[PDB]
Scaffold this active site. Structure first.
Site, PDB file in Angstrom:
ATOM      1  N   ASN A  29     -68.795 -62.095 -27.067  1.00 11.80           N
ATOM      2  CA  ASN A  29     -69.952 -61.108 -27.471  1.00 11.80           C
ATOM      3  C   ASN A  29     -69.309 -59.878 -27.675  1.00 11.80           C
ATOM      4  O   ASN A  29     -68.383 -59.542 -26.885  1.00 11.80           O
ATOM      5  CB  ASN A  29     -70.851 -60.997 -26.125  1.00 11.80           C
ATOM      6  CG  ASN A  29     -71.586 -62.614 -25.472  1.00 11.80           C
ATOM      7  OD1 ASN A  29     -71.559 -63.321 -26.195  1.00 11.80           O
ATOM      8  ND2 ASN A  29     -71.665 -62.300 -24.214  1.00 11.80           N
ATOM      9  N   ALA A  80     -67.929 -56.977 -15.110  1.00  6.65           N
ATOM     10  CA  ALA A  80     -66.561 -57.889 -15.425  1.00  6.65           C
ATOM     11  C   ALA A  80     -65.947 -58.130 -14.031  1.00  6.65           C
ATOM     12  O   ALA A  80     -64.813 -58.900 -14.230  1.00  6.65           O
ATOM     13  CB  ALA A  80     -65.703 -57.327 -16.521  1.00  6.65           C
ATOM     14  N   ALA A  81     -66.447 -57.918 -13.108  1.00  4.89           N
ATOM     15  CA  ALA A  81     -65.591 -57.995 -11.680  1.00  4.89           C
ATOM     16  C   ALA A  81     -65.775 -59.375 -11.377  1.00  4.89           C
ATOM     17  O   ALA A  81     -64.539 -59.985 -10.954  1.00  4.89           O
ATOM     18  CB  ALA A  81     -66.127 -57.171 -10.374  1.00  4.89           C
ATOM     19  N   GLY A  82     -66.698 -60.120 -11.813  1.00  8.54           N
ATOM     20  CA  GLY A  82     -66.623 -61.801 -11.671  1.00  8.54           C
ATOM     21  C   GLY A  82     -65.769 -62.205 -12.343  1.00  8.54           C
ATOM     22  O   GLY A  82     -64.987 -63.148 -12.245  1.00  8.54           O
ATOM     23  N   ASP A  83     -65.630 -61.757 -13.857  1.00  6.94           N
ATOM     24  CA  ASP A  83     -64.787 -62.297 -14.987  1.00  6.94           C
ATOM     25  C   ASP A  83     -63.273 -62.010 -14.495  1.00  6.94           C
ATOM     26  O   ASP A  83     -62.478 -63.197 -14.319  1.00  6.94           O
ATOM     27  CB  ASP A  83     -65.013 -61.744 -16.193  1.00  6.94           C
ATOM     28  CG  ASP A  83     -66.203 -61.788 -16.622  1.00  6.94           C
ATOM     29  OD1 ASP A  83     -66.654 -62.774 -16.347  1.00  6.94           O
ATOM     30  OD2 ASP A  83     -66.938 -60.858 -17.236  1.00  6.94           O
TER      31      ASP A  83
HETATM   32  N1  LIG Z   1     -67.281 -53.005  -4.122  1.00 12.27           N
HETATM   33  C1  LIG Z   1     -66.393 -53.904  -4.154  1.00 12.27           C
HETATM   34  N2  LIG Z   1     -65.180 -53.837  -3.492  1.00 12.27           N
HETATM   35  C2  LIG Z   1     -64.065 -54.490  -3.815  1.00 12.27           C
HETATM   36  N3  LIG Z   1     -64.128 -55.704  -4.265  1.00 12.27           N
HETATM   37  C3  LIG Z   1     -65.420 -55.900  -4.937  1.00 12.27           C
HETATM   38  C4  LIG Z   1     -66.275 -55.164  -5.171  1.00 12.27           C
HETATM   39  N4  LIG Z   1     -67.223 -55.688  -5.982  1.00 12.27           N
HETATM   40  C5  LIG Z   1     -66.916 -56.629  -6.373  1.00 12.27           C
HETATM   41  N5  LIG Z   1     -65.560 -57.079  -5.865  1.00 12.27           N
HETATM   42  C6  LIG Z   1     -64.807 -58.109  -6.190  1.00 12.27           C
HETATM   43  O1  LIG Z   1     -65.217 -58.767  -7.190  1.00 12.27           O
HETATM   44  C7  LIG Z   1     -65.640 -59.950  -7.024  1.00 12.27           C
HETATM   45  C8  LIG Z   1     -67.060 -60.337  -7.624  1.00 12.27           C
HETATM   46  O2  LIG Z   1     -67.995 -59.548  -7.266  1.00 12.27           O
HETATM   47  P1  LIG Z   1     -69.444 -60.006  -7.438  1.00 12.27           P
HETATM   48  O3  LIG Z   1     -70.212 -58.791  -7.517  1.00 12.27           O
HETATM   49  O4  LIG Z   1     -69.734 -61.037  -6.355  1.00 12.27           O
HETATM   50  O5  LIG Z   1     -69.645 -60.735  -8.885  1.00 12.27           O
HETATM   51  P2  LIG Z   1     -70.537 -61.042  -9.764  1.00 12.27           P
HETATM   52  O6  LIG Z   1     -70.204 -59.695 -11.124  1.00 12.27           O
HETATM   53  O7  LIG Z   1     -70.337 -62.428 -10.540  1.00 12.27           O
HETATM   54  O8  LIG Z   1     -71.838 -60.619  -9.326  1.00 12.27           O
HETATM   55  C9  LIG Z   1     -65.759 -60.100  -5.528  1.00 12.27           C
HETATM   56  O9  LIG Z   1     -65.593 -61.254  -4.767  1.00 12.27           O
HETATM   57  C10 LIG Z   1     -64.557 -58.900  -5.189  1.00 12.27           C
HETATM   58  O10 LIG Z   1     -63.309 -59.753  -5.266  1.00 12.27           O
HETATM   59 MG   LIG Z   2     -65.647 -52.629 -14.476  1.00 12.03          MG
END
Ligand SMILES: Nc1ncnc2c1ncn2[C@@H]1O[C@H](COP(=O)(O)OP(=O)(O)O)[C@@H](O)[C@H]1O
Ligand SMILES: [Mg+2]
Ligand SMILES: Nc1ncnc2c1ncn2[C@@H]1O[C@H](COP(=O)(O)OP(=O)(O)O)[C@@H](O)[C@H]1O
Lengths: 300, 300
Positions: free
Chosen positions: B9, B245-248
């Site tokens: 995308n 993109a943290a999930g990615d």
């Molecule tokens: N505030 C944060 N501090 C540290 N690590 C984070 C934080 N938010 C996300 N992460 C990292 O990103 C991963 C995925 O976060 P999450 O929000 O569950 O993903 P998604 O975007 O799929 O909902 C976490 O398991 C962790 O490794």
């Molecule tokens: Mg980011």
């Protein structure tokens, strides 16, 4: 003859099953392109309504530039003043749930480069009504008021959405035109439940703006006018199928109703007929009535 | 070596003041084209961490299409299996304001035309991990899992964004990867607030996917793992700007850890390091970390 000093946006409309919460990702359908912008909507609505109008603003040099421009002229609206700019045109990010609960955001692009010096005297010449919304810059609104005044036009400000206006910009305006949401953050009191909790919010503006006749748009319940008098103008009872072109098809119609030389009572009942029959058809610009239905509705 | 079968995308990111509600057009600054999609993000996520990686997916003929393919090629993604398709690429609608807030709506574009027929066996040959998400059709997920297992690849399903899953997919997967909301939707449970509730939920998800390791991410509380162990993996403490993109980054790092022959304890900590770092920089793909950073976080 009318002059809209207002915005030109090509809109990207993307249907979802429910609108995303903050932090949430959702898949929708394929987006579609329809011409947006309060300004453009208003010109079309006015032409549709059988009236000579001209757009003053600015389209981009992208593909959508010429579509904004084209479609506006096909409606029978003089675009000679539609000044082309680099970068994209204006673009709106519309999320609609299957009920009509939608979420709009607007990338100004070419709208936010329509500058206080872009406004040339001859856009305003022979103009009876200057119609302002705020999908263009602010100094371009203080300046568009002053030049419409110099050309002997009535200044109609459709403030969509609301800000904090100094009485600088309300002793300048000949008519202020607002909906519930805007009337609420232009006063800092309880949004109007009744036509009474509105006809009050009217004098709470007419207060700031002595010789500016104030118009307040209720939806389902119509609109109230607090100026030479205090009045309520029943809405037309019809199936609220779609409320794209809100305080907007009303705005264009009121602007056109006063231009064509109708009394205030008739142009308000004209604007009510207009922005009601807007609701019985799906979408932005295809919903905006021809003179046929409005003039036929306003007798039956 | 990793095959990503999933979405490409173009993210359109509009930087606004506030998020809207019905019949209320809202005014941003100017949209900013950024390459995205969970599949391309995860593939880029793998390549920046020094991973060998192939992308199997559909971009449209339009200009975003050629830009997405080159984008991936420029990061070290094998793009041999990226197919051109009539129509437009997928599009991220990503509203983003000061605190960060993100309302991702996804237009599917050519992603919705990635059909089972488009997965050829050689894209799977010598692959240790097939990494999937849910921005392509469910029939394509099924076929991708069958082809991966035929070739001896571990199947990692990132069941994102949230979606019901038939038992044919759930029984097919080596690792099931989900966030709080995806978990709750597949379990008809309340989203968990603690690792202890998340493990109980992970354990319940494992009853729909008994052959799978189940991993449940907890943003700022890290992740839990239900399978050969029942364990909590702590978040790295960091200054989070944009959780996009943290999930990615998490899914890609886990994928790569396992491709590299790391156990789950190592790869999950690895995934929590990469996920944490993606929160520290603004935007989607741009914020994905390089291995040297993750390694610097992992062992300070
Ligand atoms: N505030 C944060 N501090 C540290 N690590 C984070 C934080 N938010 C996300 N992460 C990292 O990103 C991963 C995925 O976060 P999450 O929000 O569950 O993903 P998604 O975007 O799929 O909902 C976490 O398991 C962790 O490794
Ligand atoms: Mg980011
Ligand atoms: N959001 C709104 N707030 C206030 N007035 C509105 C709004 N949208 C439209 N209007 C206008 O106010 C009048 C009454 O609302 P309308 O939508 O027509 O209701 P009905 O479906 O009963 O006709 C119309 O003239 C209409 O154009």
């Amino acid at each position: 003859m009318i002059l809209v000093v207002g915005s030109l946006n090509m809109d990207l409309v993307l249907r979802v099953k429910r609108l995303p919460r903050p932090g949430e990702t959702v898949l929708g359908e394929d987006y579609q392109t329809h011409p947006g912008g309060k300004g453009a909507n208003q010109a079309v609505a006015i032409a549709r309504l059988g009236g000579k109008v001209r757009m003053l603003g600015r389209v981009g040099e992208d593909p959508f530039g010429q579509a904004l421009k084209s479609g506006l002229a096909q409606e029978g609206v003089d675009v000679a003043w539609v000044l082309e700019t680099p970068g994209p045109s204006g673009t709106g990010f519309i999320l609609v749930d299957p009920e009509g609960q939608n979420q709009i955001a607007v990338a100004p692009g070419a709208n936010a480069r329509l500058v206080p010096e872009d406004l040339p005297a001859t856009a305003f010449q022979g103009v009876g009504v200057v119609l302002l919304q705020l999908e263009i810059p602010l100094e371009t609104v203080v300046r568009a008021a002053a030049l419409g005044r110099k050309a002997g036009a009535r200044i109609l400000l459709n403030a969509a959405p609301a800000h904090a206006l100094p009485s600088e910009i309300l002793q300048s305006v000949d008519l202020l035109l607002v909906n519930e949401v805007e009337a609420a953050q232009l006063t800092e009191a309880s949004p109007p439940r009744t036509p009474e909790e509105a006809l009050a919010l009217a004098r709470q503006l007419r207060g700031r703006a002595p010789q500016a006749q104030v118009v307040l748009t209720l939806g389902a319940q119509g609109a109230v006018w607090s100026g030479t008098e205090e009045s309520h103008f029943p809405a037309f009872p019809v199936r609220a199928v779609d409320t794209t072109a809100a305080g907007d098809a009303f705005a264009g119609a009121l602007a056109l109703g006063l231009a064509e030389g109708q009394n205030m009572r008739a142009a308000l009942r004209f604007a009510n007929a207009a922005g009601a029959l807007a609701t019985t058809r799906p979408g932005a610009q295809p919903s905006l009535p021809f003179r046929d239905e409005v003039e036929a509705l306003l007798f039956g």
